[PDB]
Amino acid sequence: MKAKELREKSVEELNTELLNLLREQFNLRMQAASGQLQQSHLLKQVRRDVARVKTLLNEK
Amino acid sequence: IREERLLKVLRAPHVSEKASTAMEKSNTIVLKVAKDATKAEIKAAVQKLFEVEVEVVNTLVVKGKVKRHGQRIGRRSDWKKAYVTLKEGQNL
Amino acid sequence: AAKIRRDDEVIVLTGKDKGKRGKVKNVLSSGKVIVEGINLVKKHQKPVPALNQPGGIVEKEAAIQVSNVAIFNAATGKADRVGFRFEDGKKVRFFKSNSETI
Amino acid sequence: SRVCQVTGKRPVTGNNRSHALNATKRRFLPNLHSHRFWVESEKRFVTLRVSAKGMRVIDKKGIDTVLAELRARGEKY
Amino acid sequence: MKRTFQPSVLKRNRSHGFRARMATKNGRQVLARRRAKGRARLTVS
RNA sequence: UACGGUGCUGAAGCAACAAAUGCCCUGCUUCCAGGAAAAGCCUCUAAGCAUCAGGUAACAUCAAAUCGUACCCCAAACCG
RNA sequence: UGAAGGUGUACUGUGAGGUAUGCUGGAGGUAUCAGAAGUGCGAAUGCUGACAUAAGUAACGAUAAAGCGGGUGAAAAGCCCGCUCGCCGGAAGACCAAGGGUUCCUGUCCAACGUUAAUCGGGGCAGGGUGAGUCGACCCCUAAGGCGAGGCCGAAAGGCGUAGUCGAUGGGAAACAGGUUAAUAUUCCUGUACUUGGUGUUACUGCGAAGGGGGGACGGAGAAGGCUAUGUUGGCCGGGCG
RNA sequence: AGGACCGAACCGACUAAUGUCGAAAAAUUAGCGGAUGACUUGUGGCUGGGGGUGAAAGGCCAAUCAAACCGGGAGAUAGCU
RNA sequence: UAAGGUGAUAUGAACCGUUAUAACCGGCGAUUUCCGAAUGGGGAAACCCAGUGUGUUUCGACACACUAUCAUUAACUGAAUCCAUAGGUUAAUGAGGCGAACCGGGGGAACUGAAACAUCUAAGUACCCCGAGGAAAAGAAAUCAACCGAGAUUCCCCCAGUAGCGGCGAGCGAACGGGGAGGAGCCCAGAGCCUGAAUCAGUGUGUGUGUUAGUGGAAGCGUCUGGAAAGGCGCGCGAUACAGGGUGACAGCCCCGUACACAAAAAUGCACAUGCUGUGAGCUCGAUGAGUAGGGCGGGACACGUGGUAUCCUGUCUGAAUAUGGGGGGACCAUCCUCCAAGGCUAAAUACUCCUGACUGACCGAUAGUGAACCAGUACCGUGAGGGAAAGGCGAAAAGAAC
Ligand SMILES: [K+]
Ligand SMILES: [Mg+2]
Ligand SMILES: [Mg+2]
Ligand SMILES: [Mg+2]
Ligand SMILES: [Mg+2]
Ligand SMILES: [Mg+2]
Ligand SMILES: [Mg+2]
Ligand SMILES: [Mg+2]
Ligand SMILES: [Mg+2]
Ligand SMILES: [Mg+2]
Ligand SMILES: [Mg+2]
Ligand SMILES: [Mg+2]
Ligand SMILES: [Mg+2]
Ligand SMILES: [Mg+2]
Ligand SMILES: [Mg+2]
Ligand SMILES: [Mg+2]
Ligand SMILES: [Mg+2]
Ligand SMILES: [Mg+2]
Ligand SMILES: [Mg+2]
Ligand SMILES: [Mg+2]
Ligand SMILES: [Mg+2]
Ligand SMILES: [Mg+2]
Ligand SMILES: [Mg+2]
Ligand SMILES: [Mg+2]
Ligand SMILES: [Mg+2]
Ligand SMILES: [Mg+2]
Ligand SMILES: [Mg+2]
Ligand SMILES: [Mg+2]
Ligand SMILES: [Mg+2]
Ligand SMILES: [Mg+2]
Ligand SMILES: [Mg+2]
Ligand SMILES: [Mg+2]
Ligand SMILES: [Mg+2]
Ligand SMILES: [Mg+2]
Ligand SMILES: [Mg+2]
Ligand SMILES: [Mg+2]
Ligand SMILES: [Mg+2]
Ligand SMILES: [Mg+2]
Ligand SMILES: [Mg+2]
Ligand SMILES: [Mg+2]
Ligand SMILES: [Mg+2]
Ligand SMILES: [Mg+2]
Ligand SMILES: [Mg+2]
Ligand SMILES: [Mg+2]
Ligand SMILES: [Mg+2]
Ligand SMILES: [Mg+2]
Ligand SMILES: [Mg+2]
Ligand SMILES: [Mg+2]
Ligand SMILES: [Mg+2]
Ligand SMILES: [Mg+2]
Ligand SMILES: [Mg+2]
Ligand SMILES: [Mg+2]
Ligand SMILES: [Mg+2]
Ligand SMILES: [Mg+2]
Ligand SMILES: [Mg+2]
Ligand SMILES: [Mg+2]
Ligand SMILES: [Mg+2]
Ligand SMILES: [Mg+2]
Ligand SMILES: [Mg+2]
Ligand SMILES: [Mg+2]
Ligand SMILES: [Mg+2]
Ligand SMILES: [Mg+2]
Ligand SMILES: [Mg+2]
Ligand SMILES: [Mg+2]
Ligand SMILES: [Mg+2]
Ligand SMILES: [Mg+2]
Ligand SMILES: [Mg+2]
Ligand SMILES: [Mg+2]
Ligand SMILES: [Mg+2]
Ligand SMILES: [Mg+2]
Ligand SMILES: [Mg+2]
Ligand SMILES: [Mg+2]
Ligand SMILES: [Mg+2]
Ligand SMILES: [Mg+2]
Ligand SMILES: [Mg+2]
Ligand SMILES: [Mg+2]
Ligand SMILES: [Mg+2]
Ligand SMILES: [Mg+2]
Ligand SMILES: [Mg+2]
Ligand SMILES: [Mg+2]
Ligand SMILES: [Mg+2]
Ligand SMILES: [Mg+2]
Ligand SMILES: [Mg+2]
Ligand SMILES: [Mg+2]
Ligand SMILES: [Mg+2]
Ligand SMILES: [Mg+2]
Ligand SMILES: [Mg+2]
Ligand SMILES: [Mg+2]
Ligand SMILES: [Mg+2]
Ligand SMILES: [Mg+2]
Ligand SMILES: [Mg+2]
Ligand SMILES: [Mg+2]
Ligand SMILES: [Mg+2]
Ligand SMILES: [Mg+2]
Ligand SMILES: [Mg+2]
Ligand SMILES: [Mg+2]
Ligand SMILES: [Mg+2]
Ligand SMILES: [Mg+2]
Ligand SMILES: [Mg+2]
Ligand SMILES: [Mg+2]
Ligand SMILES: [Mg+2]
Ligand SMILES: [Mg+2]
Ligand SMILES: [Mg+2]
Ligand SMILES: [Mg+2]
Ligand SMILES: [Mg+2]
Ligand SMILES: [Mg+2]
Ligand SMILES: [Mg+2]
Ligand SMILES: [Mg+2]
Ligand SMILES: [Mg+2]
Ligand SMILES: [Mg+2]
Ligand SMILES: [Mg+2]
Ligand SMILES: [Mg+2]
Ligand SMILES: [Mg+2]
Ligand SMILES: [Mg+2]
Ligand SMILES: [Mg+2]
Ligand SMILES: [Mg+2]
Ligand SMILES: [Mg+2]
Ligand SMILES: [Mg+2]
Ligand SMILES: [Mg+2]
Ligand SMILES: [Mg+2]
Ligand SMILES: [Mg+2]
Ligand SMILES: [Mg+2]
Ligand SMILES: [Mg+2]
Ligand SMILES: [Mg+2]
Ligand SMILES: [Mg+2]
Ligand SMILES: [Mg+2]
Ligand SMILES: [Mg+2]
Ligand SMILES: [Mg+2]
Ligand SMILES: [Mg+2]
Ligand SMILES: [Mg+2]
Ligand SMILES: [Mg+2]
Ligand SMILES: [Mg+2]
Ligand SMILES: [Mg+2]
Ligand SMILES: [Mg+2]
Ligand SMILES: [Mg+2]
Ligand SMILES: [Mg+2]
Ligand SMILES: [Mg+2]
Ligand SMILES: [Mg+2]
Ligand SMILES: [Mg+2]
Ligand SMILES: [Mg+2]
Ligand SMILES: [Mg+2]
Ligand SMILES: [Mg+2]
Ligand SMILES: [Mg+2]
Ligand SMILES: [Mg+2]
Ligand SMILES: [Mg+2]
Ligand SMILES: [Mg+2]
Ligand SMILES: [Mg+2]
Ligand SMILES: [Mg+2]
Ligand SMILES: [Mg+2]
Ligand SMILES: [Mg+2]
Ligand SMILES: [Mg+2]
Ligand SMILES: [Mg+2]
Ligand SMILES: [Mg+2]
Ligand SMILES: [Mg+2]
Ligand SMILES: [Mg+2]
Ligand SMILES: [Mg+2]
Ligand SMILES: [Mg+2]
Ligand SMILES: [Mg+2]
Ligand SMILES: [Mg+2]
Ligand SMILES: [Mg+2]
Ligand SMILES: [Mg+2]
Ligand SMILES: [Mg+2]
Ligand SMILES: [Mg+2]
Ligand SMILES: [Mg+2]
Ligand SMILES: [Mg+2]
Ligand SMILES: [Mg+2]
Ligand SMILES: [Mg+2]
Ligand SMILES: [Mg+2]
Ligand SMILES: [Mg+2]
Ligand SMILES: [Mg+2]
Ligand SMILES: [Mg+2]
Ligand SMILES: [Mg+2]
Ligand SMILES: [Mg+2]
Ligand SMILES: [Mg+2]
Ligand SMILES: [Mg+2]
Ligand SMILES: [Mg+2]
Ligand SMILES: [Mg+2]
Ligand SMILES: [Mg+2]
Ligand SMILES: [Mg+2]
Ligand SMILES: [Mg+2]
Ligand SMILES: [Mg+2]
Ligand SMILES: [Mg+2]
Ligand SMILES: [Mg+2]
Ligand SMILES: [Mg+2]
Ligand SMILES: [Mg+2]
Ligand SMILES: [Mg+2]
Ligand SMILES: [Mg+2]
Ligand SMILES: [Mg+2]
Ligand SMILES: [Mg+2]
Ligand SMILES: [Mg+2]
Ligand SMILES: [Mg+2]
Ligand SMILES: [Mg+2]
Ligand SMILES: [Mg+2]
Ligand SMILES: [Mg+2]
Ligand SMILES: [Mg+2]
Ligand SMILES: [Mg+2]
Ligand SMILES: [Mg+2]
Ligand SMILES: [Mg+2]
Ligand SMILES: [Mg+2]
Ligand SMILES: [Mg+2]
Ligand SMILES: [Mg+2]
Ligand SMILES: [Mg+2]
Ligand SMILES: [Mg+2]
Ligand SMILES: [Mg+2]
Ligand SMILES: [Mg+2]
Ligand SMILES: [Mg+2]
Ligand SMILES: [Mg+2]
Ligand SMILES: [Mg+2]
Ligand SMILES: [Mg+2]
Ligand SMILES: [Mg+2]
Ligand SMILES: [Mg+2]
Ligand SMILES: [Mg+2]
Ligand SMILES: [Mg+2]
Ligand SMILES: [Mg+2]
Ligand SMILES: [Mg+2]
Ligand SMILES: [Mg+2]
Ligand SMILES: [Mg+2]
Ligand SMILES: [Mg+2]
Ligand SMILES: [Mg+2]
Ligand SMILES: [Mg+2]
Ligand SMILES: [Mg+2]
Ligand SMILES: [Mg+2]
Ligand SMILES: [Mg+2]
Ligand SMILES: [Mg+2]
Ligand SMILES: [Mg+2]
Ligand SMILES: [Mg+2]
Ligand SMILES: [Mg+2]
Ligand SMILES: [Mg+2]
Ligand SMILES: [Mg+2]
Ligand SMILES: [Mg+2]
Ligand SMILES: [Mg+2]
Ligand SMILES: [Mg+2]
Ligand SMILES: [Mg+2]
Ligand SMILES: [Mg+2]
Ligand SMILES: [Mg+2]
Ligand SMILES: [Mg+2]
Ligand SMILES: [Mg+2]
Ligand SMILES: [Mg+2]
């Protein structure tokens, strides 16, 4: 995804970060605590996909 | 008002008898928050994420239990819990 | 540069089950293959309450060392040892004596 | 500290030999005094903690010549 | 019948605490020793 | 009544007397050995500033962050 | 087709020893002649570990005291519940600070821990439990004292000390009664309050310090009055007729 | 009024017995002295080893004192066992 | 590089992948909470309290920035006071701390030995402090020799336990000369013609690299015993590979390696071309380091303890000539010889190893070897400085004993 995600606008690349933080990370973090989330692997890849975006928007 | 960061505060909903009794009888929610997490930040987080009318937040820092097992001592994390009181307009 | 790998017919060189042939289920990180129908060890599986609870003895396919097996030729009809040639732009394996590609 | 501003005469150590050669450790303080020198250059007095032999260097050379050397090292006066 | 150790956490840190060692030339050397020996407990704190 | 307690109701709910080492009293009398300091607080103006900025009331609103809170604490939990 | 090591047996040399082999052991050993030594232990009130002896002996930690019934349990003098009995009561009761730090509460488990047993436990193993505008801390201010720009002094390290800044054991704003949890409550709920700041409308209007003055702001003992917490006795109300 | 009197708290430690591998590396039991002052005590300071402090016993300075404790000189030295 | 991965105790769950955006292994970036020199102020380290500007906002508010100290350098702007300095706002640049030894300097013991002990010894040793650098320090003669001549420092072996020193006791102990390792010299205290040409100190440019990832990498079979073959037995074969390790017992040929030939997108440490902000060549004439050398007094360093004591350094008080001069040649003098102090910078041989590799032991094999083969500087002990343990091995494979 990094290669496709490189070529994006600065304002538009925030919206993916805010989408990764709004739902996904939070939703899965809350859902995993209750014990309804069977698929535990989603917590990892999202945390890395944040890091990816965070690194990619550090262009200056 | 403090966008992005508000999402990191609320960790999980707390499950217990004291938690369960305070849902119906007192109209509150008990939940695990971040180590930082001020009453304003928790209120503002619950106001956005859970989307409910917050009356007042009451915070307490739980101490980590010392669990010696096998041969080594080992202590738990000092998690913070927030008794968040809601208004008359409430939900699960 | 692993000589023995997944979908590969091997023959056992040493040990009880000497001379038998089979395919590798999965080569481990420790440096040990698990070939099917080779080291059949009769484990006494204790009945765990959660999930399945059979409560009976079972024949498990135990691990064997990589050195104790060699790849089967299927031409000469015996064990053969592996090299690494550069046919085209790829490090491909080959049989020492009867230089063919797998 | 007991150090001459001009010559750098600091207090050295030595032995205090008795008639029976009993070496008891002592120290040689230099002859320091807080003296005021008239500098003719800028029309003023300059207080310098100097040894008696320093004063003779200040009289041998010029006070300005010594104050030139003092400032070269990075000192105050 | 009243023993030597009569603890007080203020006195502990005031007397033997990290900053109380850091304050002095000699106290810095203590820590430099505990670090050199490689202790987990550098000072009581 | 799971035999733990919950739910509901609930009469009188006064008077004298005594009385502290408590409180008025950080007071009063007295004695000498003659009994911390500094802010908050109140007040007056300098340097300033004049339809300003400030005060002052009145009502409104907003807020009051963070940390400790269990339990032992003349003791089987502290020092021995 | 069984090494070293362990353990027996039979030969053998003048001795330190040597040879062969049974069992155990399950993989190393080493002729001969040379070479080098951490080269031989019974003692050192030797040093470390293991195990004896006294010995199934003393002791089981206040002479405040138990008795019986029922319960659960493999099992009950000790645990639970009940009825008596005894002991403390300016404490052996109840709240705090200091200091401990989960010892609190519930469920379960007795290997070790408990100077006995243990179903019980401050024991082990899970889960739960500490909710503050008002209590305390942090915060505004200082004493003793500490630190200490420049500074003076000191062979170097550093010593002392000024403006400052820390430092409570002291000074400075405000909440109580009731209910409630298995475990928290002056915090949760219920009632009724209070204080300090910020920011707006209105009606007035001379405000403003690193400065001045007031206050804060103070000893011992004594004596006396007025009270209150609190008690006792009536009345009153509900029950009792032994 | 009082370094006044008697006497609890509090502070002490005169006598006796018990204890002496103790319940306790200084205590218990019954009596005992002071108990508004040269009193006693909480919290925090300051004084450091030939140094402190001492109503002075060579007392006390972390169960250690006619010179603390820990590390170093250091395997001091020993005509001694 | 790659077919298997999601570190371990440590199975499991849920998933990645398999010809290439899995994993892994390197280069260069990114993030880098809080304490810690800690640096906005404080503070009982990992906590508590701030201001000025910037961008935003729905009243509540966040957000990122910046603020330590000193040291030089610059502008400022300013006392007592005329000028002024003293001071004070802001600005650059640097320093602060930590680390095993080794080095130079500032201070500096005692036990002990002398069969006691005071000079002396131990010894400028331990220790404390300051400043360093890959090394450091020393260093181009005011050196030391003997009418022969040698030509800077440093380190090794001799000279030599010699000459000396010494309560002439205990003890301490040279130089000359010689053999070696390594070699290298220069700048200032300045005036002509002529000037970028030797030189370096950068921005560099050149290959060669070396290094931090790597690739290929030879040739064995059959029987016998056994749980298992690498073993015995019998025949092969590779060897610039029989170093070593693993594998169910001892493997050249089963595997990982080994010898040998190849590798780097990127960062770097080297040795030569060489464009260069920037630096000075040949040769004239004249300079040659004053409170200094020496001296008195008191100490110290020289092997040399004031002794008949040269030499150097100095705390103290004094004081030349200054190259038709001065130092030295071990009291001193006179002749000869030799150097030229009172200012600087200089590589190599030399010392060390906290640390990174590789390789080797007539080193140890769990009471040994590090205190520590093991979650050890841990448990535990101590107010604290500080002290400080014990504890290894099932088996080839968990096939860890279903019932
Ligand atoms: K009275
Ligand atoms: Mg998916
Ligand atoms: Mg509330
Ligand atoms: Mg709170
Ligand atoms: Mg932890
Ligand atoms: Mg590989
Ligand atoms: Mg390879
Ligand atoms: Mg000296
Ligand atoms: Mg004298
Ligand atoms: Mg001496
Ligand atoms: Mg003067
Ligand atoms: Mg006593
Ligand atoms: Mg003790
Ligand atoms: Mg103290
Ligand atoms: Mg102190
Ligand atoms: Mg570490
Ligand atoms: Mg009355
Ligand atoms: Mg009273
Ligand atoms: Mg009274
Ligand atoms: Mg009164
Ligand atoms: Mg009073
Ligand atoms: Mg007030
Ligand atoms: Mg007021
Ligand atoms: Mg008002
Ligand atoms: Mg606030
Ligand atoms: Mg309580
Ligand atoms: Mg309670
Ligand atoms: Mg109690
Ligand atoms: Mg009590
Ligand atoms: Mg009491
Ligand atoms: Mg009490
Ligand atoms: Mg007790
Ligand atoms: Mg008691
Ligand atoms: Mg105890
Ligand atoms: Mg046999
Ligand atoms: Mg046998
Ligand atoms: Mg044998
Ligand atoms: Mg023989
Ligand atoms: Mg023999
Ligand atoms: Mg034999
Ligand atoms: Mg045999
Ligand atoms: Mg072997
Ligand atoms: Mg052997
Ligand atoms: Mg042998
Ligand atoms: Mg031999
Ligand atoms: Mg033989
Ligand atoms: Mg023989
Ligand atoms: Mg022979
Ligand atoms: Mg021996
Ligand atoms: Mg023995
Ligand atoms: Mg003997
Ligand atoms: Mg052992
Ligand atoms: Mg018996
Ligand atoms: Mg007996
Ligand atoms: Mg008997
Ligand atoms: Mg008996
Ligand atoms: Mg008995
Ligand atoms: Mg008892
Ligand atoms: Mg007894
Ligand atoms: Mg009793
Ligand atoms: Mg009685
Ligand atoms: Mg029953
Ligand atoms: Mg039960
Ligand atoms: Mg039963
Ligand atoms: Mg049962
Ligand atoms: Mg029964
Ligand atoms: Mg039965
Ligand atoms: Mg009974
Ligand atoms: Mg009983
Ligand atoms: Mg109670
Ligand atoms: Mg506490
Ligand atoms: Mg404890
Ligand atoms: Mg516990
Ligand atoms: Mg309990
Ligand atoms: Mg049970
Ligand atoms: Mg039960
Ligand atoms: Mg039992
Ligand atoms: Mg069990
Ligand atoms: Mg028992
Ligand atoms: Mg129970
Ligand atoms: Mg428990
Ligand atoms: Mg409020
Ligand atoms: Mg307050
Ligand atoms: Mg000071
Ligand atoms: Mg200063
Ligand atoms: Mg200092
Ligand atoms: Mg200084
Ligand atoms: Mg303050
Ligand atoms: Mg206080
Ligand atoms: Mg009020
Ligand atoms: Mg009630
Ligand atoms: Mg209840
Ligand atoms: Mg109340
Ligand atoms: Mg009250
Ligand atoms: Mg009302
Ligand atoms: Mg209200
Ligand atoms: Mg009001
Ligand atoms: Mg107000
Ligand atoms: Mg101020
Ligand atoms: Mg003021
Ligand atoms: Mg007072
Ligand atoms: Mg008065
Ligand atoms: Mg009074
Ligand atoms: Mg009265
Ligand atoms: Mg009245
Ligand atoms: Mg009353
Ligand atoms: Mg009343
Ligand atoms: Mg009463
Ligand atoms: Mg009465
Ligand atoms: Mg009557
Ligand atoms: Mg009555
Ligand atoms: Mg009547
Ligand atoms: Mg009636
Ligand atoms: Mg009636
Ligand atoms: Mg009735
Ligand atoms: Mg009096
Ligand atoms: Mg009296
Ligand atoms: Mg009397
Ligand atoms: Mg009395
Ligand atoms: Mg009493
Ligand atoms: Mg007593
Ligand atoms: Mg006594
Ligand atoms: Mg008594
Ligand atoms: Mg009495
Ligand atoms: Mg009497
Ligand atoms: Mg007194
Ligand atoms: Mg007193
Ligand atoms: Mg006391
Ligand atoms: Mg006292
Ligand atoms: Mg002190
Ligand atoms: Mg001192
Ligand atoms: Mg000393
Ligand atoms: Mg005394
Ligand atoms: Mg005496
Ligand atoms: Mg002790
Ligand atoms: Mg004594
Ligand atoms: Mg002494
Ligand atoms: Mg020595
Ligand atoms: Mg000895
Ligand atoms: Mg890995
Ligand atoms: Mg893992
Ligand atoms: Mg593994
Ligand atoms: Mg794993
Ligand atoms: Mg970085
Ligand atoms: Mg920071
Ligand atoms: Mg900073
Ligand atoms: Mg700071
Ligand atoms: Mg402050
Ligand atoms: Mg600070
Ligand atoms: Mg602390
Ligand atoms: Mg902080
Ligand atoms: Mg901040
Ligand atoms: Mg600016
Ligand atoms: Mg914040
Ligand atoms: Mg700024
Ligand atoms: Mg700036
Ligand atoms: Mg700045
Ligand atoms: Mg500055
Ligand atoms: Mg300057
Ligand atoms: Mg001007
Ligand atoms: Mg002025
Ligand atoms: Mg003027
Ligand atoms: Mg001017
Ligand atoms: Mg100047
Ligand atoms: Mg200046
Ligand atoms: Mg530095
Ligand atoms: Mg060394
Ligand atoms: Mg040195
Ligand atoms: Mg001596
Ligand atoms: Mg002697
Ligand atoms: Mg002797
Ligand atoms: Mg003697
Ligand atoms: Mg010496
Ligand atoms: Mg010497
Ligand atoms: Mg340094
Ligand atoms: Mg080097
Ligand atoms: Mg260099
Ligand atoms: Mg150098
Ligand atoms: Mg030099
Ligand atoms: Mg020389
Ligand atoms: Mg020549
Ligand atoms: Mg000779
Ligand atoms: Mg003599
Ligand atoms: Mg000579
Ligand atoms: Mg000579
Ligand atoms: Mg020579
Ligand atoms: Mg050369
Ligand atoms: Mg050269
Ligand atoms: Mg290359
Ligand atoms: Mg190969
Ligand atoms: Mg074979
Ligand atoms: Mg054989
Ligand atoms: Mg043969
Ligand atoms: Mg090799
Ligand atoms: Mg080999
Ligand atoms: Mg091998
Ligand atoms: Mg090996
Ligand atoms: Mg074997
Ligand atoms: Mg072999
Ligand atoms: Mg062989
Ligand atoms: Mg062979
Ligand atoms: Mg390249
Ligand atoms: Mg290249
Ligand atoms: Mg390419
Ligand atoms: Mg770089
Ligand atoms: Mg010269
Ligand atoms: Mg001379
Ligand atoms: Mg003369
Ligand atoms: Mg002379
Ligand atoms: Mg004379
Ligand atoms: Mg002299
Ligand atoms: Mg020297
Ligand atoms: Mg000497
Ligand atoms: Mg002589
Ligand atoms: Mg001289
Ligand atoms: Mg002369
Ligand atoms: Mg003259
Ligand atoms: Mg000449
Ligand atoms: Mg001439
Ligand atoms: Mg002449
Ligand atoms: Mg001479
Ligand atoms: Mg001569
Ligand atoms: Mg010359
Ligand atoms: Mg000269
Ligand atoms: Mg020269
Ligand atoms: Mg000189
Ligand atoms: Mg060089
Ligand atoms: Mg060279
Ligand atoms: Mg290599
Ligand atoms: Mg060897
Ligand atoms: Mg061995
Ligand atoms: Mg060991
Ligand atoms: Mg062993
Ligand atoms: Mg080591
Ligand atoms: Mg550890
Ligand atoms: Mg302890
Ligand atoms: Mg400790
Ligand atoms: Mg079993």
PDB file of C-alpha atoms (C1' of nucleotides) and ligand atoms in Angstrom, chain B residues 39 59-60, chain F residues 67-69, chain G residues 131-132, ligand 4:
ATOM      1  CA  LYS B  39     -11.627  14.629  33.366  1.00  0.00           C
ATOM      2  CA  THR B  59     -11.465   9.574  37.911  1.00  0.00           C
ATOM      3  CA  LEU B  60      -9.366   7.151  39.958  1.00  0.00           C
TER       4      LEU B  60
ATOM      5  C1'   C F  67      -2.234  13.567  42.735  1.00  0.00           C
ATOM      6  C1'   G F  68      -3.813  10.402  47.625  1.00  0.00           C
ATOM      7  C1'   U F  69      -8.418   7.921  49.108  1.00  0.00           C
TER       8        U F  69
ATOM      9  C1'   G G 131     -15.355   7.935  42.381  1.00  0.00           C
ATOM     10  C1'   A G 132     -13.844  15.078  45.784  1.00  0.00           C
TER      11        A G 132
HETATM   12 MG    MG J   4      -9.373  11.821  42.600  1.00  0.00          MG
END
